[PDB]
Amino acid sequence: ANSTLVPCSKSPAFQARMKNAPDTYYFNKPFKAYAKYELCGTDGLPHLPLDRLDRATDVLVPIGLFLYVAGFIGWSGRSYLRATKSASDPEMKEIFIDLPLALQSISKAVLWPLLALQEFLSGDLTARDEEIPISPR
Amino acid sequence: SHTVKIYDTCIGCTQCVRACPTDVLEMVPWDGCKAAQIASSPRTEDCVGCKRCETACPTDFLSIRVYLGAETTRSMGLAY
Amino acid sequence: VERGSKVRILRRESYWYQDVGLVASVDKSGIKYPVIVRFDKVNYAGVNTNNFADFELLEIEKPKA
Amino acid sequence: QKVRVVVDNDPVPTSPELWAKPGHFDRTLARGPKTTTWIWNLHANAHDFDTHTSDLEDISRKIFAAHFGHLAVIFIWLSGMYFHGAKFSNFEAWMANPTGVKPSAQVVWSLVGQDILNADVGGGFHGIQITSGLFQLWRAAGITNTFQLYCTAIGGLVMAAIMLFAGWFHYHKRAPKLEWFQNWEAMMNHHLAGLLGLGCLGWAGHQIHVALPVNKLLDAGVAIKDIPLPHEFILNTSLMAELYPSFAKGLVPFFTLQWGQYADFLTFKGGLNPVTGGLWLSDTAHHHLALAVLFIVAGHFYRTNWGIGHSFKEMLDDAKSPNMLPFLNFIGPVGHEGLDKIFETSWHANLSIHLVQFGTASLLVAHHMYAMPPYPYLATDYATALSLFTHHVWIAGFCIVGGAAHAAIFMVRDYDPAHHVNNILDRTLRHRDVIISHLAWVCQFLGFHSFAMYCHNDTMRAFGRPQDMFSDTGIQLQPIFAQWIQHIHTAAVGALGTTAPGIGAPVSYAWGGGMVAVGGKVAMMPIALGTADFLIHHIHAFTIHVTVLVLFKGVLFARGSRLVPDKANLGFRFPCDGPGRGGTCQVSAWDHVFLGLFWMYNSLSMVVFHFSWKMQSDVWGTVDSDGIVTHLTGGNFATSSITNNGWLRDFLWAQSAQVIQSYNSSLSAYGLMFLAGHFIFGFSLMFLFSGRGYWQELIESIVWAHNKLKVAPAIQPRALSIVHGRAVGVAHYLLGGIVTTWAFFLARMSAIG
Amino acid sequence: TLEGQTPIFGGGTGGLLTKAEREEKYVITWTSPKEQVFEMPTGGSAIMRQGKNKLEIARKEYGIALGGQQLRAKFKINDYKIYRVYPNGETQMIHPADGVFPEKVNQGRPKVRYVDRNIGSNPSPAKLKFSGVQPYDAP
Amino acid sequence: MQHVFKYLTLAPVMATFTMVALSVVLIMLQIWFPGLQYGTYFKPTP
Ligand code: F6C
Ligand code: CLA
Ligand code: CLA
Ligand code: CLA
Ligand code: CLA
Ligand code: CLA
Ligand SMILES: CC1=C(/C=C/C(C)=C/C=C/C(C)=C/C=C/C=C(C)/C=C/C=C(C)/C=C/C2=C(C)CCCC2(C)C)C(C)(C)CCC1
Ligand SMILES: CC1=C(/C=C/C(C)=C/C=C/C(C)=C\C=C\C=C(C)\C=C\C=C(C)\C=C\C2=C(C)CCCC2(C)C)C(C)(C)CCC1
Ligand SMILES: CC1=C(C/C=C(\C)CCC[C@H](C)CCC[C@H](C)CCCC(C)C)C(=O)c2ccccc2C1=O
């Protein structure tokens, strides 16, 4: 077990940092949260270790949240781009946002992981190598 | 001097000859294209290498190619 | 190929290599590159049309009707 | 009859249809985007009106409407400044205690700890210390409360709305003909007598009736609440009589040419007010009245409609051999004949001249404002003085570069060889080789005999041979001519004998005659010049001459050169003419402007560094009860500035302690901006050092990656064009460097100022 | 010798240099319907006379630019010729080569430096190592 | 007015609106819940 990291509430340097702080909105409750939940090094500052079986939700929750949001944005963009390909003037739809199409793309991308899995299973996710422009070797 | 080559993809659009600032190219009779003419570079000694002909060429890829070679007084564009 | 057909370019140095174009006209004379193909996307020179021979094209869709 | 008003009625309908048609002004851009280069082209050609259409009249109408729009923008900015000074400032507390309160007019919200930037500026106020000098300006104008600032802000908003409506009206409703814009004589008369003259007269009236009495009461020490409102100074003539006895005699002395009785409020003192350190407001009132009279007189010089006056065309046509001076007849038998067509047809030449003169005006503003501080408590507000000088120097440099650029644009586009046959422009173009060769030689001479001498000083100091250095204690280089000018200007007022007896105090204390202190700090004192000043002034001469070399080579060779004879056909802005002729990279005049931007940045950075170091070392400081002055850097400039190791250590390294140690304090934003400017400079380095082919091939690979996932865009991604890459590089370079210097200066002078 | 009167020009610094007298020089001759102002290739404005005009220039590009972009495009003059003059007095008429402008196809002109293939079929340089032939010159 | 609506759908206008909305959301999150850190999100205030 890692011994150089101890809970912040038991770190003398972190306690000194807490006492020496300004008394504003930005410091009181954040320090209470850091003392209760964070692990502090010898410098008295919170450190984020990835070596604990416990507090694994503290790692997976932000990672999963960001992955969901990024996949949502990417799937919305991809679905909108694929929907604009069938149009006669797709560039005009890329400089002029087609609101119903964008709303439909966002609504569908709300469930982006399942749609991506289905597209990968059916081969719709990727185009074959021989239908993609390439440079001479 | 530079080397100017013309490949069989030329469509005889005469744009490269018009673009040349030193009269290196000219149009000669041909039968490989609808225009019945092809570009030629009989005066490559006067070529400066500006590659204006390549810019003017509409084919893909280029039907006229300029390969920079040994530098002379006139290929460096020197008035002195 | 003929007018209205969809083709895939097989010319290696072409900007539209392995891309899709539409045949606009075929020249019946004995010129080297009789087929004229137009493309939706322009190349680096801003040109969206080119001349190809038959062996440099792969038909992927017959002309409508 | 010749000068008359002619307009077209409803030439352009007011419809938002073209708002949904981006690039409508350009034939190429009207078809829509095919690659990402279309967006950059749309933004780059937005205001290039002469490429939208070939009709000069429509171009001029566009110029007029756009100028109204820019005036509206300026009015909005001024209204914002006044409103922030009225609502989120400590202006009243500062007016109560000018010498003990830091001006502040920006307050930040408290969300992410940025409220630490609310510095304790005195007067019970927490905010960002401003360095714009707005408080001193408002105090000099007689403003004493925030209500007047609020009223001025409302008036500024109203003026902005009026300017916007004027632009709309004069473009879409009543558009003047081309003949209207070509009235040189009427325009000059109206802008000399009506704009400068009447504005000077109005400001002199405001000063005499409002600013002088209020500021006299303020300097007398009476409180703000006991000072009556400005209108009371007009209604109650008894207050005028008490403050200035001559006002008891009304307007009689003015109309009888007995103006000498007005000397109590129209003074000619010179020097500075001992109480505040700024110029006497009565001195400035007389100055502005004299300017008003002179400008109104100048506004009757040109012939408009009554035969009286001078003609531009006749005067230009007469200026040629043999009508010139005997040694000035080399301009040839044509001379200035033919130049009138340039002003008939070319907006770009006028823009070039006016940008050059705006640069001149801003340089004069910076110099004459630090040397003769015109506002109360401005000289002793060191941060404000440094900020004003640096800001106006930079504005002047940018204006000069723009003047050169638009001169090159005129040469490429509007120049007509038929109009200039053996005239002065033609002869200049025909000996451009002489001009450029001599300029290059003098640039080399200046570079050697300034910077190589600095390197010589470095090497001699490293050897431990100070006696061999160019210094006051070694091989001296005394600027004897500048010292002589200082002595003459000091002796002129009585402080080549007494050539200006009417001025009591020295015109500027920087030339000599004494020292002025206000709040225990030096306002102005004589600025001695030695070997270091000689060296730095010749450094300035070298940098300016090289910038001139770059810009003037660009302008003179814009049409073409021995390398590319047909550059005019290629245009003002093109990347190259191919790798041939050995390589013709950056031959266009635009690239010469691009390089001149860098050289102007170098020159002006040295100018502002010289100003900052010399002011901190030999002028600014604190004065004790005994009159002994201790300066901010303790006289480093004489011995440390003669080597660039001295510049590196005692100026860059030593004076950056404030910005570098500003974390966890109210100046931490300055340290953040210091790092940000360094980052932006480093970032610009890649746009400057690389080429677009590499980026295009990398984008090819990335586009393959996007195509594999069916997410490629129809608007095909393209690397920036060569010219676009150069522009991005120079813009980010200048931004990073200027922001770095700005943060450095402002942090240091907010901490120790 | 070449006949024609030089255009009215007061002098300039973009004229001939040592290369003109040491290595080679060029002369552009033409005929105009009237006296009119044109632009010199190296800066400045000159006046071409009504008769036949002759102008000395340092590079062939100067003459090509003057003949094409100014004489034909602007003044509608099509009879201009460009000669190359050597220091020993030998003169060759080099433009147009055969009396017909190069942009117009003319019978009898041979194909020079023509490659009987598309540009993508050039052999790789590894084929021609130590053989001294470039891929574009390969048969 | 339809031209104004079409103008409002331009890529720069929509991008500015989206960035402004996201910035407002993030700013309000900072104001309401300052000092959020990894290992602290969605945890009760002590
Ligand atoms: C990558 C990198 C990085 C990272 C990673 O991760 C980060 C993170 C962090 C964290 C941890 C925190 C919190 C969290 C939250 O919020 O949480 C809630 C939410 C949720 C839960 C969720 C949310 C979600 C969302 C809403 C979604 C959406 C998003 C979008 C898309 C974005 C985009 C948009 C735009 C921007 C507009 C923070 C914060 C801070 N910041 Mg920091 N970041 C960074 C960056 C940056 C930069 C550049 C700068 C400069 C500007 C800064 C600044 C700052 C300040 C001032 C401050 C404060 O105050 C805070 C605090 O307190 O601390 C502690 N920093 N951060
Ligand atoms: C005395 C008459 C007069 C005055 C004061 C002006 C003033 C101005 N002209 Mg102008 N002009 C005049 C006559 C006059 N013109 C005539 C007769 C012609 C035709 C030959 C022109 C043709 C002309 C052109 C073609 C252009 C100008 C432009 C400008 C502006 C230059 C920018 C500047 O310095 O900002 C000064 C900043 C200010 C805030 C000044 C105040 C602005 C308002 C409009 C002044 C109103 C004064 C009025 C008497 C009301 C006063 C009320 C009370 C105080 C007494 C400036 C506002 C340029 C411009 O920007 O156009 C918009 C421009 O491109 N003028
Ligand atoms: C009275 C002032 C004035 C006026 C009216 C003009 C007018 C004009 N200039 Mg000009 N210019 C000026 C001053 C002026 N200039 C100055 C002072 C300089 C020196 C820097 C230049 C340098 C210059 C060049 C080099 C060129 C022009 C060009 C042009 C023409 C096209 C305008 C254009 O491209 O839109 C401007 C469009 C843009 C996209 C520019 C905006 C981008 C800027 C650089 C951002 C600046 C950063 C910002 C201030 C700070 C950071 C922001 C933050 C978000 C980080 C037009 C006739 C161009 C032309 O073709 O002329 C015929 C051209 O090539 N000018
Ligand atoms: C539709 C949105 C979208 C999607 C799904 C992707 C997807 C991808 N991009 Mg990509 N990209 C995009 C937009 C997008 N890009 C834009 C707009 C740019 C220009 C800034 C780039 C520039 C770019 C580069 C330079 C690289 C990728 C790479 C990649 C691949 C892995 C890394 C990654 O996710 O990008 C990370 C994301 C970025 C680098 C920037 C994208 C962020 C933009 C601003 C979001 C735009 C959202 C859009 C406006 C939504 C509108 C939809 C609405 C109308 C409904 C992946 C295939 C990499 C690759 O080839 O991997 C193999 C790579 O090197 N992209
Ligand atoms: C020679 C011109 C001149 C000078 C020296 C001054 C000097 C002064 N003015 Mg003033 N002013 C002027 C003209 C001038 N003014 C004009 C024309 C107007 C409008 C009609 C005003 C309106 C005005 C207001 C509203 C205020 C001042 C104030 C002040 C004082 C503050 C310092 C300052 O403005 O910078 C000094 C400026 C300079 C040293 C140079 C700028 C002057 C012009 C731009 C020079 C132009 C010459 C040009 C480069 C060459 C043209 C080309 C050539 C062919 C002719 C100071 C005493 C303020 C005050 O009350 O003081 C306490 C104030 O609030 N002025
Ligand atoms: C510190 C870096 C540096 C230096 C030393 C130079 C030096 C020079 N630049 Mg330059 N330049 C630079 C950065 C630099 N540049 C950058 C970053 C840019 C991008 C904007 C440019 C852009 C630029 C342009 C656009 C132009 C110049 C020009 C010049 C020359 C000006 C004439 C001169 O001063 O001659 C004197 C030479 C020096 C002062 C160089 C230092 C000499 C040392 C101190 C003494 C050497 C002693 C001895 C000879 C050594 C011999 C020993 C042996 C073993 C070698 C000169 C060669 C101009 C030019 O060509 O002028 C005609 C010009 O047009 N430069
Ligand atoms: C530099 C600059 C600036 C500004 C400045 C200023 C502040 C200026 C001013 C100006 C001015 C300040 C002007 C003025 C003008 C005026 C005028 C124009 C007037 C006129 C008047 C009149 C016309 C009158 C009339 C009358 C009446 C009403 C009644 C009775 C009769 C008589 C006639 C007397 C800024 C910073 C913003 C920005 C940058 C640049
Ligand atoms: C445990 C963990 C970790 C680690 C991890 C790892 C190591 C991972 C790996 C991973 C991997 C190894 C991966 C791979 C992948 C592959 C691929 C191949 C992919 C692909 C993708 C795609 C295809 C996508 C698509 C999409 C989507 C879905 C959405 C949006 C749009 C798009 C289109 C983009 C860490 C420490 C960090 C943190 C904590 C936890
Ligand atoms: C880096 C570089 C490029 C690549 C740069 C390109 C293609 C421009 C990319 C611009 C982007 C797309 C603008 C947007 C960037 C913003 C940071 C995105 C903000 C996103 C928000 C969600 C925050 C060139 O094309 C180039 C060309 C010629 C000389 C030098 C260079 C050069 O140095």
Short mmCIF file of N, CA and C in Angstrom, two decimals, chain D residues 699-744:
data_model
loop_
_atom_site.label_atom_id
_atom_site.label_comp_id
_atom_site.label_asym_id
_atom_site.label_seq_id
_atom_site.Cartn_x
_atom_site.Cartn_y
_atom_site.Cartn_z
N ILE D 699 -2.53 17.08 -43.48
CA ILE D 699 -3.98 17.16 -43.60
C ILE D 699 -4.50 16.08 -44.52
N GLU D 700 -3.72 15.70 -45.54
CA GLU D 700 -4.11 14.57 -46.38
C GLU D 700 -4.26 13.30 -45.55
N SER D 701 -3.27 13.02 -44.70
CA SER D 701 -3.36 11.84 -43.85
C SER D 701 -4.55 11.93 -42.89
N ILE D 702 -4.76 13.10 -42.29
CA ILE D 702 -5.87 13.27 -41.35
C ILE D 702 -7.21 13.12 -42.07
N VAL D 703 -7.29 13.62 -43.31
CA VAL D 703 -8.50 13.49 -44.10
C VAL D 703 -8.75 12.03 -44.46
N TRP D 704 -7.68 11.27 -44.71
CA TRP D 704 -7.86 9.83 -44.89
C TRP D 704 -8.45 9.21 -43.63
N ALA D 705 -7.95 9.62 -42.47
CA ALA D 705 -8.48 9.08 -41.21
C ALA D 705 -9.97 9.40 -41.06
N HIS D 706 -10.37 10.63 -41.40
CA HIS D 706 -11.78 11.00 -41.30
C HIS D 706 -12.63 10.27 -42.34
N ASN D 707 -12.09 10.07 -43.54
CA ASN D 707 -12.81 9.35 -44.58
C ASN D 707 -13.05 7.90 -44.18
N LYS D 708 -12.08 7.30 -43.47
CA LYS D 708 -12.25 5.92 -43.02
C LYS D 708 -13.49 5.76 -42.14
N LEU D 709 -13.85 6.80 -41.39
CA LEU D 709 -15.00 6.75 -40.50
C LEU D 709 -16.21 7.50 -41.06
N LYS D 710 -16.20 7.83 -42.36
CA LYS D 710 -17.32 8.50 -43.02
C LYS D 710 -17.68 9.81 -42.32
N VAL D 711 -16.67 10.56 -41.90
CA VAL D 711 -16.90 11.80 -41.17
C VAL D 711 -16.10 12.92 -41.82
N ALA D 712 -15.70 12.73 -43.08
CA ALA D 712 -14.97 13.79 -43.76
C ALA D 712 -15.94 14.90 -44.19
N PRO D 713 -15.52 16.16 -44.10
CA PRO D 713 -16.40 17.26 -44.51
C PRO D 713 -16.34 17.52 -46.00
N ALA D 714 -17.48 17.97 -46.54
CA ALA D 714 -17.53 18.35 -47.95
C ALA D 714 -16.66 19.57 -48.23
N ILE D 715 -16.64 20.53 -47.31
CA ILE D 715 -15.73 21.66 -47.42
C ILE D 715 -14.33 21.12 -47.13
N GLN D 716 -13.55 20.93 -48.19
CA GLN D 716 -12.31 20.18 -48.07
C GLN D 716 -11.29 20.96 -47.25
N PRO D 717 -10.71 20.35 -46.22
CA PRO D 717 -9.69 21.05 -45.43
C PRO D 717 -8.44 21.32 -46.26
N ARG D 718 -7.94 22.55 -46.16
CA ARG D 718 -6.73 22.95 -46.85
C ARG D 718 -5.81 23.66 -45.87
N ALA D 719 -4.51 23.47 -46.07
CA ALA D 719 -3.54 24.26 -45.33
C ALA D 719 -3.67 25.73 -45.73
N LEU D 720 -3.30 26.61 -44.82
CA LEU D 720 -3.35 28.04 -45.12
C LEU D 720 -2.43 28.35 -46.29
N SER D 721 -2.84 29.31 -47.11
CA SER D 721 -2.01 29.75 -48.21
C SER D 721 -0.69 30.31 -47.69
N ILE D 722 0.27 30.46 -48.60
CA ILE D 722 1.60 30.92 -48.21
C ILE D 722 1.52 32.30 -47.57
N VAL D 723 0.81 33.22 -48.23
CA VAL D 723 0.64 34.57 -47.70
C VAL D 723 -0.13 34.54 -46.39
N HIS D 724 -1.17 33.70 -46.32
CA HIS D 724 -1.95 33.58 -45.09
C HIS D 724 -1.09 33.06 -43.95
N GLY D 725 -0.23 32.08 -44.22
CA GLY D 725 0.68 31.59 -43.19
C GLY D 725 1.63 32.66 -42.71
N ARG D 726 2.19 33.44 -43.64
CA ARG D 726 3.06 34.55 -43.24
C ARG D 726 2.31 35.57 -42.39
N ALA D 727 1.08 35.90 -42.78
CA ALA D 727 0.29 36.86 -42.02
C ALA D 727 -0.01 36.35 -40.62
N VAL D 728 -0.39 35.08 -40.50
CA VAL D 728 -0.65 34.50 -39.18
C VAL D 728 0.61 34.53 -38.33
N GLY D 729 1.74 34.16 -38.92
CA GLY D 729 2.99 34.17 -38.17
C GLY D 729 3.34 35.55 -37.65
N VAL D 730 3.26 36.57 -38.51
CA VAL D 730 3.64 37.91 -38.09
C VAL D 730 2.65 38.45 -37.06
N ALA D 731 1.35 38.17 -37.24
CA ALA D 731 0.36 38.65 -36.30
C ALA D 731 0.58 38.06 -34.91
N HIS D 732 0.76 36.74 -34.84
CA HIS D 732 0.97 36.11 -33.54
C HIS D 732 2.30 36.54 -32.93
N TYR D 733 3.34 36.71 -33.76
CA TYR D 733 4.63 37.17 -33.25
C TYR D 733 4.50 38.53 -32.59
N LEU D 734 3.91 39.49 -33.31
CA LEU D 734 3.76 40.83 -32.76
C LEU D 734 2.87 40.83 -31.53
N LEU D 735 1.78 40.06 -31.56
CA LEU D 735 0.90 40.00 -30.40
C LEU D 735 1.64 39.47 -29.18
N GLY D 736 2.36 38.36 -29.34
CA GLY D 736 3.08 37.79 -28.21
C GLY D 736 4.12 38.73 -27.64
N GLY D 737 4.93 39.33 -28.51
CA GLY D 737 5.97 40.23 -28.03
C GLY D 737 5.40 41.45 -27.33
N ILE D 738 4.39 42.07 -27.94
CA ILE D 738 3.81 43.29 -27.38
C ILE D 738 3.10 42.98 -26.06
N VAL D 739 2.40 41.85 -25.98
CA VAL D 739 1.73 41.49 -24.73
C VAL D 739 2.75 41.20 -23.64
N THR D 740 3.86 40.54 -23.99
CA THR D 740 4.91 40.30 -23.01
C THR D 740 5.45 41.61 -22.45
N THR D 741 5.79 42.55 -23.34
CA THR D 741 6.31 43.84 -22.88
C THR D 741 5.26 44.61 -22.08
N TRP D 742 4.00 44.54 -22.49
CA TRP D 742 2.91 45.20 -21.78
C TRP D 742 2.79 44.68 -20.35
N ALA D 743 2.77 43.35 -20.20
CA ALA D 743 2.67 42.77 -18.86
C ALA D 743 3.88 43.14 -18.01
N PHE D 744 5.07 43.07 -18.60
CA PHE D 744 6.29 43.43 -17.88
C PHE D 744 6.22 44.87 -17.36
#
